[model samples]
Target: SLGAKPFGEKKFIEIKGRRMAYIDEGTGDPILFQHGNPTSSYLWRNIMPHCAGLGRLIACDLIGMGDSDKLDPSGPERYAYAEHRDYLDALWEALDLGDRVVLVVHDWGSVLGFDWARRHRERVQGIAYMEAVTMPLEWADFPEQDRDLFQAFRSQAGEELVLQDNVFVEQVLPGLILRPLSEAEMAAYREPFLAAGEARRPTLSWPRQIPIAGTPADVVAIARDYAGWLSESPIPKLFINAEPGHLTTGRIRDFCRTWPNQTEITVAGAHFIQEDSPDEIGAAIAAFVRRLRP
Candidate 1:
């Protein structure tokens, strides 16, 4: 439904006043795939099929994103991180997602997914994440260029890049992936937020939500809680790493050492690893399930 191919029909449900969009395929323990900003379930088009046999593969476009209903930015849902989490929680309640799930998340999805995981500690069977938030590191911990770019996003210039120019869709999204995307592939990701105006609030807010220097206090607290949960949770987890990754690096390196129950696998990819290494990731995840059987 999101102009994505081979992922099956796009299904939707109304949660709290928004129409939540998703691709629900296969059957078994639900393997929930959550995506991050400026993208949607469309990001999982190439990756979902590979996991179809493992369980029910469901991927969703967060509210105000993708083909889902875009709320008025001026309202209570102003593309804030907490708003996204609230919409997601409502969606979970509406769907009545069972007691256990395997999470496949990236980008902001990791933040919300981990938050959900933390609250439902006993319900998460396993976690498979990449290029996501896992700790509460500071601004200086980021590369100089990243720091500057994020700083801009938290300022007026950020709106110019995200809202006025749509740089998040035109540049940032494709720039992070390893291989070149075809014009059609680019269109799939670009069309969703095209000419969205204030509807583009989510894109602008995501960078500011990075929690650098602890500016966004609430998100920082959530990240810290998830980090602590990561260190303590006994469930089997897999971290698929790409070279020179952001969220996967820095303090995350230390967490990986002490997390105990998690395993790390490397694949040739950039930040958006699914585009360059979907098969490798799919195989690794399948093997992770086989090995852990959780």
Candidate 2:
């Protein structure tokens, strides 16, 4: 709602024959924004304006989320991490984002962006992240009270809670943000999963893909691979950690401090820090981008 329409009008492109929706603003070297589960480019709506003049700001809805094309409920594709990654890879190629790109990422988007940056080390100019899945985590990393709830997310109950009940959007999302969302804001978040059946599969898939205790070996491997690159890379980085964050908390927060060439800032919020601290997050990113060479 800042400088643009609610979610803005999304432009579509063909990725693997499926439509991918995104918002492209301003014009210069690219500043690519990637959002996590239960959120589309709408997650960056308020923050985008602050960084609008910096570059060609682009925020895309991951495959099967937001306004992007949904897969067949009865189809073989489960909307898993790999599927999302494949579509994301195709999107990058389709857009021809070029070599010098700045990545702004959050949640699962962090995993994808980090992995992409690791592979294209020379191509990435800088990175700005918040509440990112920095590395594979152990079950002990979670707070005592949240353990069971997270466990249930990977269980059969998750299908009911996420797919059927749309809990991720209706409950989990709102609960994580510190501030109260307007009715319209909440409705915008709910719009994607409003359809019945497996319309919310992507949301459910994301939680299950979380690399905990090495259950998902593939994702754990990717996390480990990216962690090494992130630690050694000389590229400038901006880390915006929040109070009582769900992913980037405790030891993970401490580890982030050790990453080379990183600027860390603490804000007042939770996982969806963008909702509570858009100005702080946006200003931090704009400053970070200014420091990078064009």
Candidate 3:
């Protein structure tokens, strides 16, 4: 029974002269939540309260998405993966999150979280992630049924679908979530990218940035570096997965098991496990946080 926007009032901070909106609630060691493409801090609304007493619950919208200030897509940077990382780096510094930070992230957020954690190892307390881009994926790693559609996302046709039509928020997001999203929920997701053309550039860039078949070598290197860090780091970690997951497939689950100090839990859902299994996800994260404190 989650409402359309359960995040309460969003607060903003200046990151590199642009307003970056975030939900900052609770108080203690920070539990930072980073969302992925096309979704915002609103994605963590239901799950965050479960961790209320554990730490400071912070969820920020990636620049150019959610309530964060949008950069012109026509600008020199084009909202690529690196640009998003740079903005996130600025946000981290601006917030001045201390060493005892727990990262609960999903999708591209996972990649960003892992990358940051690897670079700032002493600062990260623990990490919890789901449906994440954990590795430099080959085309074979993609779900067979959805392969063709993802292939199109890398093509010129993708520009028409994502940029022109705004297909990701309009069609793809709802389709991926196992349970039917309410009209209100769908509208909340769609509200940000209402403008046509370049405004949807962030969404379009994500699919292309996905490291497949060795293209986008930079992203592949980032994924590889994080994978190595995850394997070696003794930091406590949580891997939340779902039935018929899109990104966290069986192989990725197997890969995760090899990492040190890791706990894996499965819930009933699809790509957007947070939507379909908020209670399970929330409870698991709460338990993980408690364990970390103990």
Best by TM-score: 3
Cα deviation at 183, candidate 1, in Å, is 0.8
Clashing pairs in 1: none
- Per-candidate Cα lDDT values, in order, are 0.79, 0.85, 0.86
Model 1 CA lDDT for position 264? 87
Candidate 3 global CA lDDT score:
0.86
The C-alpha stretches of model 3 lying farther than 4 A from their native spots are 73-77
Q: Over all chains combined, what TM-score does candidate 2 have?
A: 0.96
What residue pairs clash in candidate 2, if any at all? none
lDDT of 2 at 151: 91
lDDT value, candidate 2, whole model: 0.85
What are the per-residue Cα lDDT tens digits for candidate 3 across 250-271? 6776787788998999898778
- TM-score of each candidate structure, all chains considered together: 0.94, 0.96, 0.97
What does candidate 1's lDDT look like per residue over 12-75, in tens digits? Answer: 9988877888888887777888899778888888777667578778888898788888886443
Q: After superposing candidate 1, which stretches have Cα over 4 Å from the reference?
A: 1-6, 73-77, 292-294
TM-score of 3: 0.97
10 residues in a row with least lDDT, candidate 3: 71-80
